[PDB]
Amino acid sequence: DVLPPEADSSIMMLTSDQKPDVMYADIGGMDIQKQEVREAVELPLTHFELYKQIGIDPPRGVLMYGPPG
Amino acid sequence: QAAELFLDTVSTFTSYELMDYKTFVTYTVYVSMIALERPDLREKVIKGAEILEVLHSLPAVRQYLFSLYECRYSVFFQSLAVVEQEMKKDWLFAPHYRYYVREMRIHAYSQLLESYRSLTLGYMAEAFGVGVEFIDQELSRFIAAGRLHCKIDKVNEIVETNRPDSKNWQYQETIKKGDLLLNRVQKLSRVINM
Amino acid sequence: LLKLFTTMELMRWSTLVEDYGMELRKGSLESPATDVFGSTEEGEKRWKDLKNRVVEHNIRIMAKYYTRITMKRMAQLLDLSVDESEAFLSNLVVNKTIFAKVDRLAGIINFQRPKDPNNLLNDWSQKLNSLMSLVNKTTHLIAKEEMIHNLQ
Amino acid sequence: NLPKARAALTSARTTANAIYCPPKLQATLDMQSGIIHAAEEKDWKTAYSYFYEAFEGYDSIDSPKAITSLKYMLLCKIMLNTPEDVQALVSGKLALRYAGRQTEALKCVAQASKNRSLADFEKALTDYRAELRDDPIISTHLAKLYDNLLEQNLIRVIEPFSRVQIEHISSLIKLSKADVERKLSQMILDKKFHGILDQGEGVLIIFDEPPVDKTYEAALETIQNMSKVVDSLYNKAKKLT
């Protein structure tokens, strides 16, 4: 017999839910920056019928360079 | 499927084959008061963006839409006739307006009898303004056709609900549709072989 | 004091006043009756709060024994009017300490139990619990059968 | 005139991007988008968010125009009662900048939104009647509040004990048959309230009992089984003849 799957593995996840950290309202005045962020965050999270329509396949890639800061 | 294929709304915009889009709004709103259930009835108009501005332009249709959610039965018989005037004078609606009449009544009467287990028809005369002998034969011809099974007491001025469809009669779809089903494979089992 | 807290049952509230009305005259030390019954505005609040101790402690044991009760029987049991009961029915139920279904048309009221949908516990406690005592018969019967047959 | 307001707003859609820099147009258009769309009653939080956008764009402008800007946005917090953005706006450093007389009365109006409490709401209703006049739509803002705050105090009285007399429980709302009990009859329709009334003896009975579990899980699967045999009828008649 295999796993369900799965029992997963060791270590752990989550731990970022303690709150509070930072409010997003700082960029709320622009709306030029948030519009590109709003389309790149919550819509790529869960949305279905909007993709196959336009046909654009959203990438999973996020690469953060530039520190400092 | 009428209103389901009409969900596109302004995405079609206006075309020579789409005639007046405001009239296309009237075609989809008259089917949306039956096929589109009350939770989804208020949802598509209020949450729907492009469809909400075109209905607010017409005070007659928007009234009857919200009055349906307001449940007042005094303005129904008036406003429903205004919709029936358009239903009478429009083509292809001649065969289809007959069942449309009392289907919007039971739609308003569905939520009606679900409210109270014991209801007096004199209290209905208030809202109907004034139903006395009119709803006597009306609601009686609803039960005989299988529409909104209910018990309305005569001369005692009491309406009874029930109907508790959550248990007993809801089981009957299993075996009844399963009779001709299994019967069809009984006969066709004797065919093999010969 | 502790007698009302243990085993409860019923006692006339004036008899409790007979005991706690002498503490005003008791003493030696009158200070326990000073901070409590010596102040007029503080006492009247604690007097009605003393009522909350005696009337709710009945509701606590009665919620265990209901089943059902008539509204008129609650008046003579709580030693007050039916309207004071409705006031004690309203303030205790908003604290949701005891679930109650109160019907004022026929006077039949009750404390809990939630509509009796229960099915499993009706059959399980029947079959499992009770029959365990019924199937344990021959177990300890042959235990005592050895006792009586070894001597006699 | 809503269609004429949107038509004037529609002409501004291509006007904002017509010239080089607005300098402030789309931000003002966002406030205008928080008027007609708010009259459309689309979403309470997004329209309130346009006031936050306009407030970010109202920095370093004429103060009488900025002192009357909080009249609309803080009284918009009155209609919503659940913007969730309460502490974000008013507790930020940008919204605390106005010490003027008119905004100090608005600062407690923004606190009045955090209040609710119909005992207090009906009280401050007279004190804020001056700000009530500046409300763009006076009825709709407080009608959706009063209608929502109605059952807010009703779910308090009906909750503790299961069944209640309908005459006294509707005496706090001051009447029974005309609207309330008809609105309460609509609550069963809206599923917000599970119960049934008694017209003759006047006792409201609440029952959440009658579940649907085993049944729809049976008949609905048999209706699908009707497609198993009918689709197999093609195999049957084809192989035999």
The 3-state secondary structure of D72-132, one letter per residue: HHHHHHHHHCCCCCHHHHHCCCCHHHCCCHHHHHHHHHHHHHHHCCHHHHHHHHHHCHHHH
3-state secondary structure of B115: coil
Solved with: cryo-EM
Distances (CA, A) of C139 to C126, C131, C136: 20, 13, 5
Residue B168: phi and psi, rounded to 5, are -80, -70
Residues β-bridged to residue B193: none
Residue C103 contacts residue D163 (beta carbons within 8 Å): yes
Cβ atoms of B149 and B163 within 8 Å: the answer is yes
* CA pair distance B185, B80, nearest whole angstrom: 49
* Chain D nearest C-alpha distance from C13 (Å): 27
Percent of chain A as helix, strand, coil, to the nearest 5: 35, 0, 65
Identify the helix (H) or strand (E) that includes residue D165: strand D164-165
DSSP type of residue C34:
I
Q: What is the Cα Rg of chain A in Å?
A: 18
Q: With an 8 Å Cβ cutoff, are D226 and B177 in contact?
A: yes
d(CA D217, CA D212): 9
Contact between chains at D30 and A29 (C-beta distance less than 8 A): no
Instruction: For residue D24, give how far its alpha carbon lies from the nearest alpha carbon of chain A (Å).
Output: 12
Which of chain D's residues have a Cβ under 8 Å away from the Cβ of A28?
Answer: 52-53, 56
Does D30 reach chain A within 8 Å, measured CB to CB? yes
Q: Residue written as tokens 């030693």?
A: C79
Report the alpha-carbon distance of residue B159 to residue B118 in Å, rounded: 5
Which residue in chain D is spatially nearest to B47 when comparing CA positions? Answer: D42
Residues annotated within the binding site of A for ATP are 66-69
DSSP state of C113: -
Interface probe for B, chosen from D6, D189, D203 (most Cβ of B below 10 Å), is: D189
Q: C32 preceded by cis ω (within 30°)?
A: no
Cβ atoms A35, A49 nearer than 8 A: no
- Give the whole-angstrom CA distance, residue A45 versus residue C146: 75
Contact residues, chain A, for D30 at CB < 8 Å? 31
CB C21 within 8 A of CB C15: no
Question: Does residue B44 contact residue B8 with C-beta atoms inside 8 Å?
Answer: no
Residues with Cβ < 8 Å from C110, sequence gap 6 or more? C66, C67, C68, C69, C100, C101
Quick count: other Cβ atoms within 10 Å of Cβ C51?
A: 16
Give the distance from residue D121's alpha carbon to the nearest chain B alpha carbon, in angstroms.
26
Binding-site residue numbers of A are 66-69
Please check whether residue B71 is in contact with residue B111, taking contact to mean a CB–CB distance below 8 angstroms. yes
CA-wise closest residue to B189 among D228, D233, D227 = D233
CA distance, residue D160 to nearest chain A CA (Å): 34
Neighboring chain D residues of B117 at a CB cutoff of 8 Å: 196-198
**Three-state DSSP state, D205:** strand
* CB spacing of D41 vs B46 below 8 angstroms: yes
Instruction: At A63, list the tokens.
Output: 């690469």
Q: Do D52 and A23 touch (CB under 8 A)?
A: no
Question: Where do the H-state alpha helices sit in B6-133?
Answer: 21-31, 38-47, 50-56, 59-70, 76-89, 97-113, 121-128
Task: Say whether the peptide bond before residue C28 is cis (omega within 30 degrees of 0).
Answer: yes
Q: Report d(CA D159, CA D117) in Å as an integer.
A: 18
User: How does D200-220 read in b/e, with b if 16+ C-beta sit within 10 Å?
Assistant: eebbbebeeeeeeeebeeebe
User: Strand order in C69-70's β-sheet?
Assistant: C69-70, C108-111, C100-102
Measured CA to CA in angstroms, residue C87 lies from B160, C92, C110, D19, D163 at distances of: 34, 9, 16, 72, 16
Strand B118-119 to B158-160 pairing: antiparallel
Using the Cβ of C33 and the Cβ atoms of chain D, whether some distance falls under 8 Å is answered with no
Instruction: State the Rg of chain C over Cα.
Output: 24
- The Cα–Cα gap between A59 and D92 comes to 36
Q: Are B97 and B87 in contact (CB under 8 A)?
A: yes
One-letter amino acid at B190 equals R
Query: Tokens for B144?
Result: 């005989």
Q: Dihedral of CA B152/B153/B156/B161: which sign?
A: negative
Q: Are B36 and B48 in contact (CB under 8 A)?
A: no
CB pair distance less than 8 Å for C104 and D161: no
Angle at alpha carbon of residue D139, lines to D133 and D142, rounded to 5°: 90
Tokens linked to D110: 């923004």
Place of tokens 């069944």: D163
| Cβ distance of D199 and B120 shorter than 8 Å | yes
Alpha helices in chain C (DSSP H): 2-5, 13-25, 31-33, 40-65, 71-78, 82-94, 120-124, 131-135, 137-151
Cα(C18)–Cα(B161) distance, rounded to whole angstroms? 56
**Helices D69-80 & D138-158 angle (0-180, nearest 10):** 30
How many residues in chain A? 69
Identify any residues that bridge with C101 across adjacent strands, giving them in sequence order.
C110
Distance CA(A44)–CA(A59), nearest Å, equals 9
Tokens of A68: 């400092």
D201 touches chain C (CB under 8 A): yes
In units of Å, what resolution does this entry have?
8.0
Tokens for B143, please give them.
Answer: 């039960």
Q: Which residues of D touch chain B, with CB atoms under 8 Å apart?
A: 2-3, 6, 40-42, 177, 182, 185-186, 188-189, 196-200, 210-212, 215-216, 218-219, 222-223, 225-226, 229, 233, 236, 240
